[PDB]
Protein backbone atom coordinates (compact mmCIF):
# COMPACT_ATOMS: atom_id res chain seq x y z
CA UNK A 1 0.00 0.00 0.00
CA UNK A 2 -0.33 2.10 -2.05
CA UNK A 3 -3.69 3.78 -2.69
CA UNK A 4 -6.63 3.72 -3.91
CA UNK A 5 -7.77 6.96 -5.65
CA UNK A 6 -10.22 9.85 -5.07
CA UNK A 7 -13.02 10.31 -7.63
CA UNK A 8 -15.53 13.17 -8.00
CA UNK A 9 -19.34 12.75 -7.83
CA UNK A 10 -20.87 10.10 -10.10
CA UNK A 11 -24.20 9.96 -11.96
CA UNK A 12 -24.93 6.24 -12.38
CA UNK A 13 -24.44 5.04 -15.96
CA UNK A 14 -22.84 8.28 -17.21
CA UNK A 15 -20.37 8.17 -14.27
CA UNK A 16 -18.43 11.46 -14.14
CA UNK A 17 -19.72 12.85 -17.48
CA UNK A 18 -22.42 15.28 -16.20
CA UNK A 19 -19.79 17.15 -14.08
CA UNK A 20 -18.34 18.89 -17.14
CA UNK A 21 -21.73 19.65 -18.68
CA UNK A 22 -20.58 23.27 -18.68
CA UNK A 23 -19.19 25.87 -21.06
CA UNK A 24 -16.11 25.87 -18.79
CA UNK A 25 -14.77 22.27 -18.39
CA UNK A 26 -11.14 23.02 -17.54
CA UNK A 27 -12.00 25.51 -14.81
CA UNK A 28 -14.43 23.08 -13.22
CA UNK A 29 -11.72 20.40 -13.18
CA UNK A 30 -9.44 22.85 -11.32
CA UNK A 31 -12.09 23.28 -8.62
CA UNK A 32 -12.46 19.48 -8.51
CA UNK A 33 -8.68 19.36 -8.17
CA UNK A 34 -8.78 21.93 -5.34
CA UNK A 35 -10.84 19.57 -3.20
CA UNK A 36 -9.43 16.13 -4.16
CA UNK A 37 -5.78 17.18 -4.48
CA UNK A 38 -2.80 15.89 -6.46
CA UNK A 39 -4.54 13.08 -8.41
CA UNK A 40 -8.16 12.16 -9.21
CA UNK A 41 -9.87 9.68 -11.54
CA UNK A 42 -12.40 10.82 -14.13
CA UNK A 43 -14.52 8.26 -15.93
CA UNK A 44 -16.98 8.70 -18.75
CA UNK A 45 -18.84 5.94 -20.61
CA UNK A 46 -16.04 3.59 -21.66
CA UNK A 47 -13.02 5.84 -20.94
CA UNK A 48 -10.94 6.64 -17.83
CA UNK A 49 -8.52 9.49 -17.23
CA UNK A 50 -6.50 10.41 -14.16
CA UNK A 51 -5.96 14.17 -13.80
CA UNK A 52 -2.68 15.25 -12.19
CA UNK A 53 -2.20 18.54 -10.35
CA UNK A 54 1.11 18.30 -8.44
CA UNK A 55 4.77 18.67 -9.42
CA UNK A 56 5.86 15.55 -7.52
CA UNK A 57 3.60 13.39 -9.71
CA UNK A 58 3.83 15.39 -12.94
CA UNK A 59 7.65 15.22 -12.97
CA UNK A 60 7.18 11.44 -13.07
CA UNK A 61 4.61 11.46 -15.89
CA UNK A 62 7.06 13.68 -17.80
CA UNK A 63 9.60 10.83 -17.82
CA UNK A 64 9.69 10.00 -21.55
CA UNK A 65 10.98 6.48 -20.85
CA UNK A 66 7.89 5.67 -18.81
CA UNK A 67 5.13 7.77 -20.40
CA UNK A 68 4.57 9.04 -23.93
CA UNK A 69 2.24 11.57 -25.55
CA UNK A 70 -1.35 10.40 -25.76
CA UNK A 71 -4.16 11.65 -27.92
CA UNK A 72 -6.91 12.48 -25.44
CA UNK A 73 -10.57 12.32 -26.38
CA UNK A 74 -10.11 16.06 -27.01
CA UNK A 75 -7.24 15.52 -29.47
CA UNK A 76 -9.00 12.62 -31.19
CA UNK A 77 -11.84 15.06 -31.88
CA UNK A 78 -9.44 17.77 -33.06
CA UNK A 79 -7.87 15.10 -35.32
CA UNK A 80 -11.03 15.34 -37.49
CA UNK A 81 -9.55 18.54 -38.99
CA UNK A 82 -5.96 18.58 -37.65
CA UNK A 83 -5.64 15.16 -39.36
CA UNK A 84 -2.26 13.56 -38.79
CA UNK A 85 -0.32 16.82 -38.29
CA UNK A 86 2.33 17.36 -35.62
CA UNK A 87 -0.14 18.09 -32.81
CA UNK A 88 -2.51 15.13 -33.32
CA UNK A 89 -0.25 12.21 -34.18
CA UNK A 90 1.37 9.56 -31.95
CA UNK A 91 5.11 9.73 -31.29
CA UNK A 92 5.55 6.39 -33.05
CA UNK A 93 3.30 7.31 -35.97
CA UNK A 94 5.43 7.49 -39.12
CA UNK A 95 4.20 10.97 -40.02
CA UNK A 96 5.14 12.58 -36.67
CA UNK A 97 8.94 12.25 -36.68
CA UNK A 98 9.08 12.66 -40.44
CA UNK A 99 7.34 16.06 -40.20
CA UNK A 100 9.16 17.00 -36.98
CA UNK A 101 12.52 16.66 -38.72
CA UNK A 102 11.36 18.38 -41.93
CA UNK A 103 9.70 21.34 -40.15
CA UNK A 104 12.19 21.82 -37.30
CA UNK A 105 14.66 24.03 -39.22
CA UNK A 106 11.76 26.49 -39.66
CA UNK A 107 12.12 27.27 -35.92
CA UNK A 108 15.89 27.69 -35.69
CA UNK A 109 17.37 31.01 -34.51
CA UNK A 110 18.20 31.82 -38.13
CA UNK A 111 14.56 31.51 -39.18
CA UNK A 112 13.47 33.80 -36.31
CA UNK A 113 15.88 36.52 -37.48
CA UNK A 114 14.12 36.18 -40.84
CA UNK A 115 10.62 36.13 -39.35
CA UNK A 116 11.27 39.31 -37.42
CA UNK A 117 10.66 41.77 -40.31
CA UNK A 118 7.22 40.26 -41.01
CA UNK A 119 6.39 40.08 -37.31
CA UNK A 120 7.01 43.83 -37.16
CA UNK A 121 4.82 44.35 -40.26
CA UNK A 122 1.79 42.96 -38.41
CA UNK A 123 2.70 44.60 -35.07
CA UNK A 124 2.97 48.03 -36.71
CA UNK A 125 -0.51 47.52 -38.14
CA UNK A 126 -1.94 46.86 -34.67
CA UNK A 127 -0.27 49.93 -33.16
CA UNK A 128 -1.54 52.02 -36.09
CA UNK A 129 -5.12 50.81 -35.50
CA UNK A 130 -4.86 51.71 -31.82
CA UNK A 131 -3.34 55.11 -32.76
CA UNK A 132 -6.33 55.77 -35.02
CA UNK A 133 -9.20 55.24 -32.54
CA UNK A 134 -11.31 58.20 -31.50
CA UNK A 135 -11.52 59.28 -27.85
CA UNK A 136 -15.04 57.77 -27.53
CA UNK A 137 -13.64 54.32 -28.35
CA UNK A 138 -12.17 51.21 -26.75
CA UNK A 139 -10.04 48.20 -27.71
CA UNK A 140 -11.44 44.67 -27.83
CA UNK A 141 -8.30 42.87 -26.60
CA UNK A 142 -8.62 39.21 -27.62
CA UNK A 143 -10.32 40.15 -30.95
CA UNK A 144 -7.35 42.36 -31.85
CA UNK A 145 -4.88 39.84 -30.46
CA UNK A 146 -6.34 37.13 -32.72
CA UNK A 147 -6.07 39.63 -35.57
CA UNK A 148 -2.38 40.04 -34.86
CA UNK A 149 -1.52 36.40 -34.16
CA UNK A 150 -3.27 34.89 -37.19
CA UNK A 151 -1.90 37.56 -39.51
CA UNK A 152 1.57 36.97 -38.06
CA UNK A 153 1.63 33.20 -38.61
CA UNK A 154 0.01 33.66 -42.03
CA UNK A 155 2.79 35.97 -43.27
CA UNK A 156 5.91 34.59 -41.54
CA UNK A 157 4.92 31.00 -42.25
CA UNK A 158 3.00 31.14 -45.53
CA UNK A 159 3.64 34.57 -47.11
CA UNK A 160 -0.13 34.95 -47.13
CA UNK A 161 -1.99 38.02 -45.87
CA UNK A 162 -5.23 37.46 -43.96
CA UNK A 163 -5.60 41.25 -43.62
CA UNK A 164 -7.42 40.82 -40.31
CA UNK A 165 -6.98 44.53 -39.65
CA UNK A 166 -9.01 45.35 -42.77
CA UNK A 167 -11.95 43.62 -41.10
CA UNK A 168 -14.14 44.76 -38.20
CA UNK A 169 -15.62 41.29 -37.68
CA UNK A 170 -13.48 38.15 -37.19
CA UNK A 171 -11.97 36.51 -40.29
CA UNK A 172 -14.18 33.64 -41.55
CA UNK A 173 -11.35 31.14 -40.85
CA UNK A 174 -11.45 32.17 -37.19
CA UNK A 175 -15.26 32.00 -37.00
CA UNK A 176 -15.03 28.48 -38.45
CA UNK A 177 -12.11 27.51 -36.20
CA UNK A 178 -13.98 28.69 -33.10
CA UNK A 179 -17.11 26.76 -34.13
CA UNK A 180 -15.07 23.60 -34.78
CA UNK A 181 -13.14 23.78 -31.50
CA UNK A 182 -16.45 24.56 -29.80
CA UNK A 183 -17.95 21.32 -31.17
CA UNK A 184 -14.88 19.25 -30.26
CA UNK A 185 -15.37 20.47 -26.69
CA UNK A 186 -19.08 19.70 -26.91
CA UNK A 187 -18.55 16.10 -28.02
CA UNK A 188 -16.69 15.50 -24.75
CA UNK A 189 -19.99 15.96 -22.90
CA UNK A 190 -22.73 14.20 -24.87
CA UNK A 191 -21.70 10.55 -25.44
CA UNK A 192 -24.67 10.05 -27.80
CA UNK A 193 -23.41 11.47 -31.14
CA UNK A 194 -25.59 9.28 -33.40
CA UNK A 195 -28.75 11.00 -32.11
CA UNK A 196 -30.20 13.19 -34.94
CA UNK A 197 -30.56 15.83 -32.22
CA UNK A 198 -26.95 16.38 -33.36
CA UNK A 199 -27.69 16.34 -37.11
CA UNK A 200 -27.24 20.07 -37.59
CA UNK A 201 -23.96 19.97 -35.62
CA UNK A 202 -22.08 17.64 -37.98
CA UNK A 203 -23.49 19.60 -40.95
CA UNK A 204 -21.96 22.88 -39.66
CA UNK A 205 -18.82 20.99 -38.61
CA UNK A 206 -18.29 19.87 -42.22
CA UNK A 207 -19.14 23.42 -43.34
CA UNK A 208 -16.47 24.87 -41.01
CA UNK A 209 -13.79 22.39 -42.11
CA UNK A 210 -14.44 23.18 -45.80
CA UNK A 211 -14.00 26.89 -45.01
CA UNK A 212 -10.67 26.00 -43.40
CA UNK A 213 -9.61 23.70 -46.24
CA UNK A 214 -10.67 26.23 -48.89
CA UNK A 215 -8.21 28.68 -47.38
CA UNK A 216 -5.41 26.12 -47.50
CA UNK A 217 -6.10 25.75 -51.24
CA UNK A 218 -5.68 29.52 -51.69
CA UNK A 219 -2.46 29.40 -49.66
CA UNK A 220 -1.06 26.59 -51.86
CA UNK A 221 -2.34 28.27 -55.07
CA UNK A 222 -0.61 31.56 -54.16
CA UNK A 223 2.63 29.66 -53.59
CA UNK A 224 2.77 27.90 -57.00
CA UNK A 225 2.66 31.30 -58.74
CA UNK A 226 4.43 33.94 -56.58
CA UNK A 227 7.88 34.05 -58.20
CA UNK A 228 10.03 36.12 -55.79
CA UNK A 229 9.82 33.16 -53.42
CA UNK A 230 10.29 33.24 -49.64
CA UNK A 231 12.16 30.74 -47.46
CA UNK A 232 9.50 30.05 -44.85
CA UNK A 233 7.49 27.29 -43.16
CA UNK A 234 5.65 26.30 -46.35
CA UNK A 235 8.88 26.19 -48.40
CA UNK A 236 10.11 23.48 -46.04
CA UNK A 237 6.84 21.52 -46.23
CA UNK A 238 7.15 21.28 -50.02
CA UNK A 239 10.93 20.94 -50.50
CA UNK A 240 12.30 19.37 -47.31
CA UNK A 241 13.13 15.68 -47.16
CA UNK A 242 13.55 13.67 -43.94
CA UNK A 243 17.07 12.20 -43.44
CA UNK A 244 15.78 9.11 -41.54
CA UNK A 245 13.04 8.08 -43.98
CA UNK A 246 14.58 9.92 -46.97
CA UNK A 247 11.06 11.18 -47.81
CA UNK A 248 9.20 14.40 -48.62
CA UNK A 249 5.78 15.03 -47.05
CA UNK A 250 2.77 13.87 -49.08
CA UNK A 251 0.11 16.40 -50.07
CA UNK A 252 -2.51 14.91 -47.67
CA UNK A 253 -0.19 15.60 -44.73
CA UNK A 254 0.89 19.08 -45.94
CA UNK A 255 -2.77 20.17 -45.90
CA UNK A 256 -2.93 18.97 -42.29
CA UNK A 257 0.21 20.86 -41.21
CA UNK A 258 -1.07 24.07 -42.82
CA UNK A 259 -4.30 23.76 -40.80
CA UNK A 260 -2.32 22.71 -37.70
CA UNK A 261 0.13 25.64 -37.82
CA UNK A 262 -2.52 28.16 -38.82
CA UNK A 263 -4.51 27.24 -35.70
CA UNK A 264 -1.99 26.04 -33.10
CA UNK A 265 0.31 28.80 -34.32
CA UNK A 266 -1.90 31.70 -33.27
CA UNK A 267 -4.81 30.80 -30.99
CA UNK A 268 -2.80 30.24 -27.82
CA UNK A 269 -0.51 33.20 -28.55
CA UNK A 270 -3.64 35.37 -28.81
CA UNK A 271 -4.72 34.06 -25.40
CA UNK A 272 -1.28 34.78 -24.02
CA UNK A 273 -1.20 38.42 -25.22
CA UNK A 274 -4.74 38.86 -23.84
CA UNK A 275 -4.06 37.39 -20.37
CA UNK A 276 -0.76 39.31 -20.26
CA UNK A 277 -2.37 42.72 -20.78
CA UNK A 278 -5.17 41.87 -18.33
CA UNK A 279 -2.71 41.10 -15.53
CA UNK A 280 -0.68 44.22 -16.41
CA UNK A 281 -3.74 46.51 -15.96
CA UNK A 282 -4.76 44.72 -12.72
CA UNK A 283 -1.18 45.30 -11.54
CA UNK A 284 -0.21 48.88 -12.48
CA UNK A 285 3.21 48.82 -10.83
CA UNK A 286 4.58 45.84 -12.78
CA UNK A 287 3.09 47.48 -15.88
CA UNK A 288 5.16 50.60 -15.13
CA UNK A 289 8.26 48.42 -14.73
CA UNK A 290 7.43 46.78 -18.09
CA UNK A 291 6.82 50.16 -19.77
CA UNK A 292 10.19 51.42 -18.50
CA UNK A 293 12.08 48.45 -19.98
CA UNK A 294 10.10 48.81 -23.17
CA UNK A 295 10.96 52.53 -23.45
CA UNK A 296 14.62 52.09 -22.46
CA UNK A 297 15.26 49.28 -24.99
CA UNK A 298 13.09 50.19 -27.99
CA UNK A 299 15.00 53.34 -28.94
CA UNK A 300 14.24 52.94 -32.66
CA UNK A 301 10.95 53.50 -34.55
CA UNK A 302 10.93 49.77 -35.32
CA UNK A 303 12.41 47.11 -32.99
CA UNK A 304 15.29 44.94 -34.12
CA UNK A 305 15.76 41.25 -33.33
CA UNK A 306 18.42 42.06 -30.69
CA UNK A 307 16.12 44.54 -28.96
CA UNK A 308 13.31 42.03 -28.47
CA UNK A 309 15.95 39.64 -27.10
CA UNK A 310 16.86 42.38 -24.62
CA UNK A 311 13.30 42.77 -23.30
CA UNK A 312 14.06 40.64 -20.24
CA UNK A 313 11.29 41.83 -17.95
CA UNK A 314 8.70 41.52 -20.72
CA UNK A 315 9.79 37.88 -21.05
CA UNK A 316 9.12 37.40 -17.34
CA UNK A 317 5.70 39.04 -17.65
CA UNK A 318 4.68 36.55 -20.38
CA UNK A 319 5.99 33.57 -18.38
CA UNK A 320 4.06 34.67 -15.28
CA UNK A 321 0.95 34.97 -17.48
CA UNK A 322 1.70 31.44 -18.69
CA UNK A 323 2.02 30.35 -15.05
CA UNK A 324 -1.43 31.47 -13.95
CA UNK A 325 -3.35 30.82 -17.19
CA UNK A 326 -1.55 28.49 -19.60
CA UNK A 327 -3.52 28.89 -22.81
CA UNK A 328 -3.20 25.24 -23.86
CA UNK A 329 -4.36 24.18 -20.39
CA UNK A 330 -3.83 20.39 -20.56
CA UNK A 331 -1.86 17.59 -22.17
CA UNK A 332 -2.31 13.82 -22.13
CA UNK A 333 0.16 10.98 -21.52
CA UNK A 334 -0.15 7.19 -21.38
CA UNK A 335 1.80 4.57 -19.43
CA UNK A 336 4.24 2.76 -21.74
CA UNK A 337 4.23 -0.27 -19.43
CA UNK A 338 2.82 -1.39 -16.11
CA UNK A 339 4.23 1.06 -13.57
CA UNK A 340 3.73 2.63 -10.11
CA UNK A 341 3.32 6.42 -9.91
CA UNK A 342 4.74 8.33 -6.94
CA UNK A 343 5.10 5.11 -4.94
CA UNK A 344 1.36 5.22 -4.20
CA UNK A 345 -0.68 4.65 -7.39
CA UNK A 346 -0.53 1.54 -9.59
CA UNK A 347 -1.07 2.13 -13.31
CA UNK A 348 -1.67 -0.31 -16.15
CA UNK A 349 -0.12 -0.28 -19.64
CA UNK A 350 -1.88 2.45 -21.64
CA UNK A 351 -3.70 4.17 -18.75
CA UNK A 352 -4.29 7.86 -19.34
CA UNK A 353 -2.82 10.75 -17.35
CA UNK A 354 -4.08 14.28 -18.09
CA UNK A 355 -1.71 16.95 -16.83
CA UNK A 356 -3.91 19.73 -15.46
CA UNK A 357 -1.45 22.53 -16.18
CA UNK A 358 -3.11 25.45 -14.39
CA UNK A 359 -3.24 23.41 -11.17
CA UNK A 360 0.38 22.38 -11.60
CA UNK A 361 1.25 26.08 -11.67
CA UNK A 362 -0.53 26.58 -8.32
CA UNK A 363 1.34 23.86 -6.39
CA UNK A 364 2.23 25.69 -3.15
CA UNK A 365 5.07 23.27 -2.33
CA UNK A 366 6.85 24.74 -5.36
CA UNK A 367 5.83 28.34 -5.88
CA UNK A 368 5.53 29.44 -2.25
CA UNK A 369 2.28 30.50 -0.62
CA UNK A 370 1.40 33.60 -2.73
CA UNK A 371 0.58 31.45 -5.79
CA UNK A 372 -2.53 33.39 -6.83
CA UNK A 373 -0.79 36.75 -7.22
CA UNK A 374 0.88 38.14 -10.35
CA UNK A 375 4.63 38.43 -9.71
CA UNK A 376 6.96 38.29 -12.76
CA UNK A 377 9.95 38.36 -10.38
CA UNK A 378 9.44 34.64 -9.60
CA UNK A 379 11.41 34.00 -12.78
CA UNK A 380 14.48 36.03 -11.71
CA UNK A 381 16.15 32.72 -10.77
CA UNK A 382 14.62 29.82 -12.78
CA UNK A 383 17.46 27.51 -11.62
CA UNK A 384 15.79 27.42 -8.18
CA UNK A 385 12.58 26.11 -9.83
CA UNK A 386 12.43 22.29 -9.79
CA UNK A 387 12.30 20.28 -13.01
CA UNK A 388 8.78 19.94 -14.48
CA UNK A 389 7.10 22.69 -12.46
CA UNK A 390 6.53 25.04 -15.39
CA UNK A 391 5.00 23.27 -18.37
CA UNK A 392 2.97 25.60 -20.59
CA UNK A 393 4.76 24.38 -23.74
CA UNK A 394 4.22 20.67 -23.08
CA UNK A 395 6.89 18.03 -22.51
CA UNK A 396 9.93 16.38 -24.06
CA UNK A 397 10.15 15.64 -27.76
CA UNK A 398 6.41 16.32 -28.01
CA UNK A 399 6.93 19.83 -26.58
CA UNK A 400 5.82 22.92 -28.51
CA UNK A 401 7.79 23.28 -31.73
CA UNK A 402 6.67 26.93 -32.04
CA UNK A 403 7.56 28.05 -28.50
CA UNK A 404 10.27 30.57 -29.44
CA UNK A 405 7.96 31.82 -32.20
CA UNK A 406 5.14 32.53 -29.75
CA UNK A 407 7.43 34.20 -27.20
CA UNK A 408 9.31 36.30 -29.75
CA UNK A 409 6.09 37.54 -31.33
CA UNK A 410 4.52 38.07 -27.89
CA UNK A 411 7.61 39.88 -26.59
CA UNK A 412 7.94 42.21 -29.60
CA UNK A 413 4.23 43.00 -29.64
CA UNK A 414 3.77 43.52 -25.87
CA UNK A 415 7.00 45.55 -25.83
CA UNK A 416 5.66 47.79 -28.61
CA UNK A 417 2.23 48.12 -27.00
CA UNK A 418 3.90 49.41 -23.83
CA UNK A 419 6.19 51.89 -25.58
CA UNK A 420 3.44 53.53 -27.64
CA UNK A 421 0.46 53.46 -25.24
CA UNK A 422 -0.85 54.05 -21.76
CA UNK A 423 -3.66 51.64 -20.96
CA UNK A 424 -6.78 52.05 -18.84
CA UNK A 425 -9.18 49.50 -17.38
CA UNK A 426 -12.14 51.85 -17.90
CA UNK A 427 -14.80 49.20 -17.21
CA UNK A 428 -12.76 47.67 -14.36
CA UNK A 429 -12.89 44.32 -16.14
CA UNK A 430 -13.97 41.19 -14.29
CA UNK A 431 -12.20 38.09 -15.65
CA UNK A 432 -14.48 35.78 -17.63
CA UNK A 433 -12.54 32.91 -19.21
CA UNK A 434 -13.98 31.43 -22.40
CA UNK A 435 -13.17 27.77 -23.07
CA UNK A 436 -12.52 26.47 -26.59
CA UNK A 437 -10.24 23.72 -25.33
CA UNK A 438 -7.81 26.65 -25.30
CA UNK A 439 -8.20 29.52 -22.82
CA UNK A 440 -8.87 33.17 -23.57
CA UNK A 441 -10.62 36.02 -21.69
CA UNK A 442 -14.04 37.00 -23.00
CA UNK A 443 -15.13 40.64 -23.28
CA UNK A 444 -11.89 42.08 -21.91
CA UNK A 445 -11.82 45.69 -23.06
CA UNK A 446 -9.44 48.59 -22.39
CA UNK A 447 -8.71 52.12 -23.51
CA UNK A 448 -5.36 53.35 -24.75
CA UNK A 449 -4.19 56.94 -25.08
CA UNK A 450 -1.18 57.37 -27.37
CA UNK A 451 2.23 58.28 -25.98
CA UNK A 452 2.54 60.03 -29.37
CA UNK A 453 5.89 58.46 -30.23
CA UNK A 454 6.35 58.06 -34.03
CA UNK A 455 6.61 54.71 -35.85
CA UNK A 456 6.82 53.13 -39.35
CA UNK A 457 9.40 51.42 -41.60
CA UNK A 458 11.38 48.16 -42.08
C1 LIG B 1 1.48 30.83 -25.68
C2 LIG B 1 1.63 30.27 -27.07
C3 LIG B 1 1.61 28.76 -27.10
C4 LIG B 1 1.20 27.78 -26.08
C5 LIG B 1 0.68 27.97 -24.68
C6 LIG B 1 1.44 26.49 -26.76
C7 LIG B 1 1.17 25.23 -26.07
C8 LIG B 1 1.55 23.90 -26.55
C9 LIG B 1 1.43 22.67 -25.72
C10 LIG B 1 0.95 22.53 -24.29
C11 LIG B 1 1.86 21.69 -26.57
C12 LIG B 1 1.96 20.20 -26.26
C13 LIG B 1 0.70 19.45 -26.64
C14 LIG B 1 0.42 18.24 -26.14
O1 LIG B 1 1.20 17.69 -25.33
O2 LIG B 1 -0.64 17.67 -26.49
C15 LIG B 1 2.18 22.36 -27.75
C16 LIG B 1 2.67 21.63 -28.92
C17 LIG B 1 2.70 22.17 -30.28
N1 LIG B 1 2.61 23.49 -30.55
FE1 LIG B 1 2.35 25.02 -29.27
N2 LIG B 1 1.92 26.54 -28.03
C18 LIG B 1 2.01 27.87 -28.23
C19 LIG B 1 2.54 28.40 -29.49
C20 LIG B 1 2.65 27.66 -30.74
C21 LIG B 1 2.85 28.34 -32.04
C22 LIG B 1 2.97 29.81 -32.33
C23 LIG B 1 2.89 27.19 -32.96
C24 LIG B 1 3.05 27.18 -34.47
C25 LIG B 1 4.26 27.97 -34.94
C26 LIG B 1 2.72 26.10 -32.12
C27 LIG B 1 2.67 24.75 -32.67
C28 LIG B 1 2.71 23.51 -31.89
C29 LIG B 1 2.89 22.21 -32.59
C30 LIG B 1 3.03 21.96 -34.07
C31 LIG B 1 2.89 21.27 -31.45
C32 LIG B 1 3.03 19.77 -31.44
C33 LIG B 1 4.35 19.38 -32.06
C34 LIG B 1 4.81 18.13 -32.02
O3 LIG B 1 4.15 17.24 -31.43
O4 LIG B 1 5.90 17.92 -32.59
N3 LIG B 1 2.57 26.32 -30.79
N4 LIG B 1 2.01 23.70 -27.79
C1 LIG C 1 -4.76 24.80 -30.83
C2 LIG C 1 -4.66 23.31 -30.63
C3 LIG C 1 -5.79 22.81 -29.74
C4 LIG C 1 -5.37 21.59 -28.93
C5 LIG C 1 -6.02 21.52 -27.56
C6 LIG C 1 -5.09 21.98 -26.45
C7 LIG C 1 -5.84 22.15 -25.14
C8 LIG C 1 -5.84 20.89 -24.30
C9 LIG C 1 -7.19 20.18 -24.23
C10 LIG C 1 -8.08 20.74 -23.14
C11 LIG C 1 -9.36 19.96 -22.95
C12 LIG C 1 -9.66 19.83 -21.46
C13 LIG C 1 -11.10 19.50 -21.16
C14 LIG C 1 -11.25 18.12 -20.53
C15 LIG C 1 -11.79 17.14 -21.55
C16 LIG C 1 -12.34 15.87 -20.97
O1 LIG C 1 -11.63 15.13 -20.26
O2 LIG C 1 -13.51 15.52 -21.21
From Swiss-Prot:
Effect of residue 268 to N: High substrate-free turnover rate constant. Negligible substrate-induced spin-state and substrate-induced heme reduction-potential shifts on addition of saturating concentrations of arachidonate
Effect upon mutating residue 86 to E: Ineffective covalent modification of the heme macrocycle. Extensive formation of Fe(II)CO complex in the substrate-free form
Residues binding heme, per UniProt: 400
Superkingdom, taxonomy of origin: Bacteria
Segments for region (Cytochrome P450): 1-458
Cellular localization per UniProt: Cytoplasm
Phenotype for residue 264 to M: No effective fatty acid oxidation. No effect on electron transport from NADPH to FMN. Slightly lower high-spin conversion with arachidonate, palmitoleate, palmitate, myristate and laurate/dodecanoate
Biotechnological utility: This protein is a target of protein engineering. Its selectivity-directing and activity-enhancing mutations have been extensively studied and the designed mutations allow this enzyme to act on non-native substrates and/or in order to enhance production of synthetically desirable end-products.
Consequence when changing residue 401 to E: Ineffective covalent modification of the heme macrocycle. 2-fold apparent limiting rate of flavin to heme electron transfer for arachidonate-bound enzyme
Site positions per UniProt: Important for catalytic activity: 268
Effect of mutating residue 47 to Q/S: 2-3-fold decrease in binding affinity for N-myristoyl-L-methionine as substrate
Induction: By pentobarbital. Expression is negatively regulated by repressor bm3R1 at the transcriptional level.
Segments crossing the lipid bilayer: none
Binding site for (9Z)-hexadecenoate: 51
Function, as annotated: Functions as a fatty acid monooxygenase. Catalyzes hydroxylation of fatty acids at omega-1, omega-2 and omega-3 positions. Shows activity toward medium and long-chain fatty acids, with optimum chain lengths of 12, 14 and 16 carbons (lauric, myristic, and palmitic acids). Able to metabolize some of these primary metabolites to secondary and tertiary products. Marginal activity towards short chain lengths of 8-10 carbons. Hydroxylates highly branched fatty acids, which play an essential role in membrane fluidity regulation.
Family label: In the N-terminal section; belongs to the cytochrome P450 family.
Name of the protein in question: Bifunctional cytochrome P450/NADPH--P450 reductase
Biological source species: Priestia megaterium (strain ATCC 14581 / DSM 32 / CCUG 1817 / JCM 2506 / NBRC 15308 / NCIMB 9376 / NCTC 10342 / NRRL B-14308 / VKM B-512 / Ford 19) (Bacillus megaterium)
Residues represented out of the complete protein: 2 to 459 of 1049
Amino acid sequence: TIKEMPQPKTFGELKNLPLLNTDKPVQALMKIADELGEIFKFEAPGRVTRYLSSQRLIKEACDESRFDKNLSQALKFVRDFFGDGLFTSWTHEKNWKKAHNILLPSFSQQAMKGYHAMMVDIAVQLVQKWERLNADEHIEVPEDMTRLTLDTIGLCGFNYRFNSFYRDQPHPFITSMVRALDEAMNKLQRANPDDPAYDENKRQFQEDIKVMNDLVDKIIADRKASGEQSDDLLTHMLNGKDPETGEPLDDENIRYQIITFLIAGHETTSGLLSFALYFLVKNPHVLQKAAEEAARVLVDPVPSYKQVKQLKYVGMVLNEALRLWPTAPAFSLYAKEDTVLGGEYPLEKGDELMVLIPQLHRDKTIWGDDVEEFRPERFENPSAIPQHAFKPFGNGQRACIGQQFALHEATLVLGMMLKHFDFEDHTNYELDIKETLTLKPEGFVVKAKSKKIPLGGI
